[model samples]
Target: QMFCNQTACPADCDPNTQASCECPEGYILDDGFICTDIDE
Candidate 1:
């Protein structure tokens, strides 16, 4: 599972607010909303 500081899980941010995704190892944020497997 993924986690974020002030954003929702499976992280997503709004233009009005500032938020970021915090994915675990081997995972990354895709399109800044969903988490995906790291290519490298």
Candidate 2:
């Protein structure tokens, strides 16, 4: 399945390494697939 990409998981992450999608700038990645708040 297509998940988050380098944009979402720039580095090899844990839990959701299967991610292969990209997220908009300024947002945080969840499950390496979904984009959530940055929470700054």
Candidate 3:
């Protein structure tokens, strides 16, 4: 299954910002769908 913020997450996103979406705890969302590890 493909993960997406639009339905899988709501708290990590803001409709009025440069980085419209954010990742969970130790992760990073770069291209809306590209979830990466911040610790990397």
Candidate 4:
């Protein structure tokens, strides 16, 4: 899972910034702050 410091996450952001977060492959971003499994 990942997280963004701003109000919303951009299409993409540098992981080094630590201002954004993303889920691993096969997962989807849920509620903009949670990572949920696509299989579900």
Write down the lDDT of every candidate, Cα atoms only: 0.45, 0.41, 0.40, 0.46
- lDDT tens digits, residue span 1-40, model 4: 4434333454355657533446444345556454443333
Candidate 2 lDDT over 1-40, as tens digits, reads 2224432334343365534334444344565346433332
Best by TM-score: 1
How far out, in Å, is residue 37 in model 1? 4.8
Candidate with the larger lDDT of 3 and 4: 4
**Candidate 1 residue-wise lDDT, 1-40, digit = tens:** 3334423345554343333344545455666555444442
Residue-level error in angstroms, candidate 2, position 1: 26
Which scores greater on TM-score, model 1 or model 4?
A: 1
lDDT of 1 at 4: 42
TM-score of 1: 0.29
Task: Summing lDDT over every window of 10 consecutive residues in candidate 3, give the lowest-scoring window.
Answer: 1-10
Ranking by lDDT: 4, 1, 2, 3
Could you tell which candidate, 1 or 2, scores higher by TM-score? Answer: 1
Q: Which parts of model 1 are misplaced by more than 4 Å? A: 1-9, 12-20, 37-40
Per-residue CA lDDT of candidate 3, range 1-40, in tens? 2122333433344564423244544355554454443333
Q: What C-alpha lDDT does candidate 4 achieve relative to the native structure?
A: 0.46
